[PDB]
């Protein structure tokens with residue numbers, strides 16, 4: 001059986017704080033485009049809010065940061081996220097000890113967020129090294145990036161595919 005799902009289509013996110021590694025606008029853009037990857041294949045729609053309680057909180061932090069999953073310094077775990085639910089449910093956390101970038105150096109924020117949001121929507125890891133839900137990081141350019149068949153099958157068995165027209 002698989003884990004619980006969001007039981008609505010309009011889902012909100014809030015960026016709690018920004019990493020200083022990147023331009024603030026680029027954080028915004030990378031996160032929006034990572035949600036779009038998943039919006040493109042489901043009926044889910046994501047919007048950013050700046051106040052109010054959001055479904056998905058995006059956090060940058062080092063070490064312990066208030067949940068049961070203290071980060072571990074540079075390398076190791078890069079980020080983690082919680083599956084659908086209230087409260088900490090759906091939240092996505094990125095380790096500030098990594099160096100977050102818009103490019104092939106350090107750790108690419110966009111690619112990392114697509115994986116984390118995969119978790120936030122209910123997915124687990126894939127055994128396919130081409131899947132974005134493969135557990136370890138491997139850079140691919142934002143332009144060439146595509147969800148694998150396995151990523152699509154996974155997300156569509158949870159939410160359906162849309163819906164158009």
Ligand SMILES: [Ca+2]
Pocket residue numbers: 071072073074075076077078095097098
């Ligand atoms: Ca780490």
Ligand SMILES: [Ca+2]
Pocket residue numbers: 054055056057085086087088089090091
């Ligand atoms: Ca939440």
Ligand SMILES: [Ca+2]
Pocket residue numbers: 019021095096097098099100
């Ligand atoms: Ca950093």
Ligand SMILES: [Zn+2]
Pocket residue numbers: 065067069070080093
């Ligand atoms: Zn955390």
Ligand SMILES: [Zn+2]
Pocket residue numbers: 115119125135
């Ligand atoms: Zn993961």
